[PDB]
Design a protein around this ligand. Sequence first.
Ligand SMILES: [Mg+2]
Ligand SMILES: [Mg+2]
Lengths: 934, 934
Amino acid sequence: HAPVVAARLRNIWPKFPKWLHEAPLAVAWEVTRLFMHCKVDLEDESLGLKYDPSWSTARDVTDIWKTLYRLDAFRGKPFPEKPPNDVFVTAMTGNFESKGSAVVLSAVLDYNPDNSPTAPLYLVKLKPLMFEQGCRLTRRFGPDRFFEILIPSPTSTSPSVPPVVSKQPAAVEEVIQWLTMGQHSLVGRQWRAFFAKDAGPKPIIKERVHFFAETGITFRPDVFQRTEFKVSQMLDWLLQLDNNTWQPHLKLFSRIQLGLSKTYAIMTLEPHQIRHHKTDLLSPSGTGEVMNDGVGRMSRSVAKRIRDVLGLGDVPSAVQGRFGSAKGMWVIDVDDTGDEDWIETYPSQRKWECDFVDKHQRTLEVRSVASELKSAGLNLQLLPVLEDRARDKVKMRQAIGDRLINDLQRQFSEQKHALNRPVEFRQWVYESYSSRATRVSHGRVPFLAGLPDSQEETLNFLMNSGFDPKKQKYLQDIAWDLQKRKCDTLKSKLNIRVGRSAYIYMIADFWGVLEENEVHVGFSSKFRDEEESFTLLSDCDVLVARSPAHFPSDIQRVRAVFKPELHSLKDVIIFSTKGDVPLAKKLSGGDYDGDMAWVCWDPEIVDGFVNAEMPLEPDLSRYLKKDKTTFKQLMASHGTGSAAKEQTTYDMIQKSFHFALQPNFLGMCTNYKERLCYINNSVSNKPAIILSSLVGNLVDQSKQGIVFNEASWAQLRRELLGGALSLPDPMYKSDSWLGRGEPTHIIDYLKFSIARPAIDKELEAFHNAMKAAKDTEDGAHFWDPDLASYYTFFKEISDKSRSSALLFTTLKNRIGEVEKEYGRDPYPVRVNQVYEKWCAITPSKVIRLLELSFLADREMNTWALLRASTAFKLYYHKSPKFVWQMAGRQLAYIKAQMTSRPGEGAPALMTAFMYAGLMPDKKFTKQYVARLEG
Amino acid sequence: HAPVVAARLRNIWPKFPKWLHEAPLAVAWEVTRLFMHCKVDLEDESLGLKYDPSWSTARDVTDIWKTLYRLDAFRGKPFPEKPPNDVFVTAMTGNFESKGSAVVLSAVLDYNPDNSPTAPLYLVKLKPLMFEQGCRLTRRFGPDRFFEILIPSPTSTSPSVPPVVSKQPAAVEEVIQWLTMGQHSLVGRQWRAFFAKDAGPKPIIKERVHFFAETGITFRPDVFQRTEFKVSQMLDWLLQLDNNTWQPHLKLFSRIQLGLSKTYAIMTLEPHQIRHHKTDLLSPSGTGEVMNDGVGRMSRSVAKRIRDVLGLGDVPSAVQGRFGSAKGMWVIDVDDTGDEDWIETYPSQRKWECDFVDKHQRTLEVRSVASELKSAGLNLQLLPVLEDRARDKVKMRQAIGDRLINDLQRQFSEQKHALNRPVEFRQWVYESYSSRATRVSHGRVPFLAGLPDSQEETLNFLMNSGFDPKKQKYLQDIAWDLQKRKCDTLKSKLNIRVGRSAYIYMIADFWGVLEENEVHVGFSSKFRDEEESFTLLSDCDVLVARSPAHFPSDIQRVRAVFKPELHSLKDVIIFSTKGDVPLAKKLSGGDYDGDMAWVCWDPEIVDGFVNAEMPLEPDLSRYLKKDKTTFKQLMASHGTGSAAKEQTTYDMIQKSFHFALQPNFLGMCTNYKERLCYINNSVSNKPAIILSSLVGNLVDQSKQGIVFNEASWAQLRRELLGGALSLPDPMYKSDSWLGRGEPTHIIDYLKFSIARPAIDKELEAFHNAMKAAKDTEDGAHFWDPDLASYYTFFKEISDKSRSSALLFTTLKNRIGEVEKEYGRDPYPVRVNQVYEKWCAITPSKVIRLLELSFLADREMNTWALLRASTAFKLYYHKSPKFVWQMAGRQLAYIKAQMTSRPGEGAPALMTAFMYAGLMPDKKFTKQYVARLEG
Ligand SMILES: [Mg+2]
Ligand SMILES: [Mg+2]
């Protein structure tokens, strides 16, 4: 209770008018969207609203907008963005649920640029209805009963946040109280907050908040659409709270995310088909250490059902999933020769005490599946630890630089060789970038004016009509804008490719075949590495790590040993369940609940590596303070019974919001550690081990109820390190070397001594080169007599003219006016405006032939060809970008017309749709060139 | 010495004129080709020949033919076929050798249709110069010194052979004597025969004969281009005869093929890098049985050199090859951790005693490499043995029929579902047939008149311009001509697909890890089988066989056991070197010199199979007679010394020709066995075991010097079987069931009770269907108002006309005349003649716009569009095939023009070349449809 805030926080939501009370939910939503967008008051008695019965039977939102919109006070504009028909129909007539898809109600709030109280504080914009995969909670209660917002974080220091908030300390408490203390009215429902989390110049970070429709003017009571139902009951259904009062309430709150997790429901197992283990697999040595933390077995038939329902090409050996209170990985049991469905759970997987009675508690839900692997490369964060652990560091670093030089050299040589032939450049362009998703989405290649959106797509579009990148300059210009942008990217991550490396899901050996420092890795298909290929790993040492590696021991060298017993388990890496300490825990305190290991079998990287043992970690208890207050202790303030428990549930939501919305130090302490280790150039000295242990403990902050605030951070740096004082940014944060002398920090050296010279050297190759291009024959020109084809044709006619002649003159004149327009708001919109003036350049018996009006698409007439060529003749000079951008499309037609030769095959006129479905045939390219070259 | 033959056999070769003696070899060859083809005498003094100096510097044969040809008496015609430039240049200026390629001199002889002696007997036609991969012998002596012919077999009974030959018993001896006894003059060289072999209504089979240029008017003596050199010396170089006189001379002659084998030379190994073993790996049990017959190890570096020189994507684990006298397989040694080059040979691989001194004796030559595997299916010849060996035969046969029904059902359902959408039908059409090699060869899709050659290519060409197979009838007609032809093929091999089967090179276990009935099979990549995938085989039983399987024991069930020690050996199957008898020898007396096993791991096929032991084979020595006469015994007729040895060599050639040219009984006895086993319906009774043993012994007939003639065949059937008497053909040789009642012989049953009903039932589905197609809207029509577009445009103009009008009338008239021409010699030539009359239908200011003469390709003008549409309007009726075949190409353009819509993307005009390089993108199709279907 500030109050300042309020009154601000009025009144934040759009009102729900009486004329609109006959809904339905989806109409209410999408109509409210047209009103807010057009800036139209929904409680206006000047507009004569109303309610179109027709909206009730609507199958396209555009019908409930053209209403409307009409009225005159709606124009505007057009838009809102608009929900897709199939989505809208589902929301209208399919229960907000289409197979696995939920219809999602969402909004984004931004601070009100306005001011004074009693202005809102937040502006709300309602997103269009959309599909997203459902989750346990939307399958149980209905997708239409869930609402989510993105909202500016109330503890966001700073500086672009309203004064009104935070120069008024706690009302951070007022914002949360607004969020959580009562119901929010939106589109005729009563929404209550039950979850908050982080989101999926310098902007204000937003937090995602989830609301549940507890009631609304369509619901009905109760005990004992659509029935009234409280958040406390919903969460009790999810978490079986009676049996989980022993839990730290912040940790219990964090489990709510497991009901919100977007998942694929696979199948519901019968109780007799479920095996709950009372104990985990423990260390053979008696350490009591859990050896299979987060991982269990499933039958083979269960995995086949997953292939089936998900439509996988193959039975997956392991999946990341949920099952009642259980969360983690399940791996096929290699000993399963039956055909009966079963799954097991282990204590380490079960996040609350669950009776597993209702079918939703016994449904296997899949988050992700073990899939075919792809090369991982080396991330620069692994490098300091790899260098630290090197038997010989000078050689390691010479080798890594040589590797970067070679790979770069290698990619340049392939680009420049491919550039020498249209079939080959097309193949190279196609391979350089995937356009399939864009093509699938549009049912064609999208165009901006007369050319594809995409530079890559523009190159191939033009080459497919016969242009040559070594002959035409525009093609040339784009080809190298592309190579430039790619150089920029390389100098900005140090993701050195290591062909023999991959990120692989970690699984534990239930079957007792792997000795302690042995791992089993078999692949589902051929893993290729330039000259060599692998279907599995055997008799070699490998490096394993989890990102990020902080401790010297966070990367381990072990032996890859293929066990025939585990042959069927593919695209996972199996760790031993022997020894004192699971291998997973050595990899940055990891486990088997979805962790993936960086696995490296590259000999040069593996062979110089020496294992370090686990660090003696410091006691950080003075700084890291765990709130261990249980749900039972919170309930003691209210008493006993149902009302006591209900209020305790809401207490937990409010106290946990107050915890979730505190600043994140993980990021801050990680950056300090980056900076400190950089200046020290050490990841293994005492300060380094302290900060790595620190950030390690902050990862589980939320479910450990660790309180760590500013005073404690300062105290900890005061007492154990620095340098309150900002540490300087590493030099590698800058674009150029701003250091003194030669780089010393392996990253500085790789970016500044190695990468930067090599890049600039590789770019001096074809600016050289540019430059090397008058009448060698070769080279590359804007001129192409083929494209002045129709120009010269009609000038001849034109001669001769009488009055064609006059038509031809108007044409040249108008083109001139439009090039002037091109000379002079976002970019695509301005280009369109000019394109539209361009297309507006329009013409017995000669005009009829040029116009071909029986064609619905103007831009396919002979006139368009003539207009394009005339513009080319007049402006290839002069304004090359103008002509190509407007008329690229018809220049291409003309080129394909002109280069055609009798008896040398037929040019193909492809529809936009059918063209989008073809790709370059790499075998054709390869075989055709091979025959060209003798 | 008949003589009858001669004089016939004159004078068989084209003469070599004096005016042509200044060569060069290639000019002589190709000029002689123009003369023989045009029917022009090369010893003509009426023509004023001559010799163009310009021919000497020629780089295109067309230059030495347009000479010429000229003259007037050369027209004619055009052709000969013509050698490719790169080939001609190599022959002219590159020594007949281009890298690995030899330029080949070849001719085909056919019996002279003429008659009387002194007519030739044979007509000779000289093939155009061509590239073929070289061989040991052409690398050693030069490709230009080798000549090969195809020649009618002189023992070819019958009946279309000249009376003159064989109704004159032995002159089979006169033909061979002509071939072998002396030199043959051809294009100024003296050719001597050194090898003969079988070739690579009912025609007369030809035999391939090889000649060596021993001298010619350009050569020079000798001892001690291009030097004189005898065949006896050449063969002595090849076979090191001094050390091989112990060999049966027919067997020694058969080794000549090893110098002729087309191969890739890889690398030459130093003597210290070669390991010759004195003994093979022998049976552990003391049987003395060779356990690695034909197989040896090579180092890893040797295999990498093979990947290198051959340009393989991967190091091959094994190769089929030659190396001095050694022939067989070499497999990488898994124990090789060095990087030194080495190879070994074993006695079983070495086919003569070789000192391995010259570099050509120490060069590894590769015939083929172990490559990625593909599904094999079940051939019908395996079936009788599989049925014989079935634990339960009634169930086996029920199962096999069900499988055939299901697979058929399955392929029909996929075809008919794909047919429902142009993107999907295109994808299905593309997958149904590979056109890439044709496309690579032409640098485009070849057209016949207005459409692609290929029906499949025609469908996609038309769909890519917007036609729909469910809407247009012509597209429909072709789509189903295609499905018909494919049904015809299925009813005509019983190649029942078994997804889990492959043909795999057999290798022996040098490393002692496989127990006797264990095999090791790992694949180089994912082997897919519908719902399941394999990178290797482990813990299952498998069937192994070599085709053909005759004995009940020729198929064996064994255990697939993956050995980690052999993990690196991929796409080969390793057999144990333990036990009494190598597994290879049990598979139809096979071995490890290139044999491939049918490997089957399909559970349903494997599980009912019971192994039989080796048959007690009969003694066939009375019928099968081995000529064991050695080279030493032949030399005893001439004496001792160099002249004696030389004449003995020629004796061996002549006696061995006389042996090679005897009738082949393998084929005849195999067919008798087919027929006998069919009537008996048994492959395991005594007659069956006798005939299988018979054909087994006849396989090695040539190098075993087994004499087996007609009298002995008759004697053997008289004494051990039948039925001299022809046995009837199996019923399955006929197209319809001509048997009595239900088929009893599993093949009769599968073809007649199962396949034939199912096929006819699956074809009654879409003739039904045809038929189900007036104005449901749907269905499929010839009419398309889009294609009458230009017709209606110009009729309107035309109106209105004055005199366009007159132009339009001539146009319709001419089209009419050309459709009449289409109504009325090979097919493609006649179509062209009409196409040419079609293209000849040709037109101030209106004609100029229709004609667009600045376009080099007429068929891209607006006139062509108008002509095509007018013809369509007039004739879609009437003659649908006429219009589409002539104007398909412009109908497509019009369709793509007409269906284009503003703001729905741009049609693409692709060049013929660039169009040939694209393929349907299966991921696009799949993803696009998935979004279409919600
Ligand atoms: Mg984890
Ligand atoms: Mg063999």
